[PDB]
Amino acid sequence: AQNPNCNIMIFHPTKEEFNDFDKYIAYMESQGAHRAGLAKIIPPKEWKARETYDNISEILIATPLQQVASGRAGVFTQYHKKKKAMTVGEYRHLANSKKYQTPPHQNFEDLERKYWKNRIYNSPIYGADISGSLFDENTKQWNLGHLGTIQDLLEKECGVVIEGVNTPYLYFGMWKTTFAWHTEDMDLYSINYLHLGEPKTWYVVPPEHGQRLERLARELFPGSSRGCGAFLRHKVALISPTVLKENGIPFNRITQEAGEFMVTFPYGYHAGFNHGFNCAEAINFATPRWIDYGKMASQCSCGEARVTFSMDAFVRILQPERYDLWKRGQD
C-alpha cells in the first residue's frame, strides 16, 4: 500500500505532466497521496496563472464576514457577522492596518503558536466565497475555471444527465482568518490555488480516520452534536493541533505559499488559517473514485448548512433515501 502513514505529499510536475489534469490526479493517487487527505502541487517553473495581480483592486467583496469566536483557545466555534461591502483595495488596506496586520514573528512555527494562543481574542474579516476567477483565459493548464464539471463526471460514470453548474470561488484573507474543520459538500475533492500574498496553513485528517475526528467533535461540542448529526457541515468548529494530539487524532499540517496548489481528497477533513493578506481561488471537482464517497456522504438536514443549487441533483441521484429529509432542511 503506498503512503501507509498518510503523510502529506508534495508534487513537482513537469510542464508536460501539467497538461492533463485528470491524469495527474490519478498519478498522485497511484503514489498514495489521497491517504493524507491533502497534497501540495508546485507548478512547473514555466507556468503562470496570469501575467500580473496589479489590476485586482476593484473587485468587490459584497459581504465581508467578521469571524467572531466563542469558547477556549484550542476549542472554539466561530460565527460570521456580515459587514458592509468593500473593494479588494479597501480590504487590503484594512488587512494591513495596525488592528489586523500580522504581528512580528520568527518563522511559520512561531506564527502558528501565536495563532492558536490568540485567535479567539480577535475577530478578523474574511472575503470568502466570491464567485469568480483570476486565471487568465489563455492559461490552459490547471485553470480552475476550465475544469471538467462534476455534473459531467456524474453523467459519464453513471449515465444520468443532471442540471447544475460548477464555478470557482475567490477568497480574500487576512491574519487569523480561519477555515473551520470540514469535508467538502458531498465529500468532493477541492483544489485551491494561492494567487498572491501571505501563506495559508492547513491541518488535515486522513480520510480513513475521519470518523475519529467526528467522535472527538461530538465530545467537544456536545450541544451542537445534539442539534445535528452532521454538524461539522455547518463549518463553524475549530480544534487545535494540541487538542488533537492530546486526544490521539491522526493529522498532518502544511503551509501553502503563493503560487502553489493544494488538493483535498474525498472525506479529508481540513481546517486552517491565513498568515496575512492573501487571495486564493478554489473549486470542487470529482473523479471516478469520488462516486463511492458521494454515495456515503453525511448530510446536514437541520437547516443550518444551506448549500448551492447544484447539490440537489447529487443527493437526488446518489442518495435517494436521504433526499426528502435533506431537501426539507434546504427549505
Ligand SMILES: O=C(O)CNC(=O)C(=O)O
Ligand atoms: O481557503 C479557505 O478559506 C478554505 N478552502 C478550502 O476549504 C478548500 O479549498 O477546500
Ligand SMILES: [Mg+2]
Ligand atoms: Mg479590479
Ligand code: NI
Ligand atoms: Ni475545503
Ligand SMILES: [Zn+2]
Ligand atoms: Zn445541521
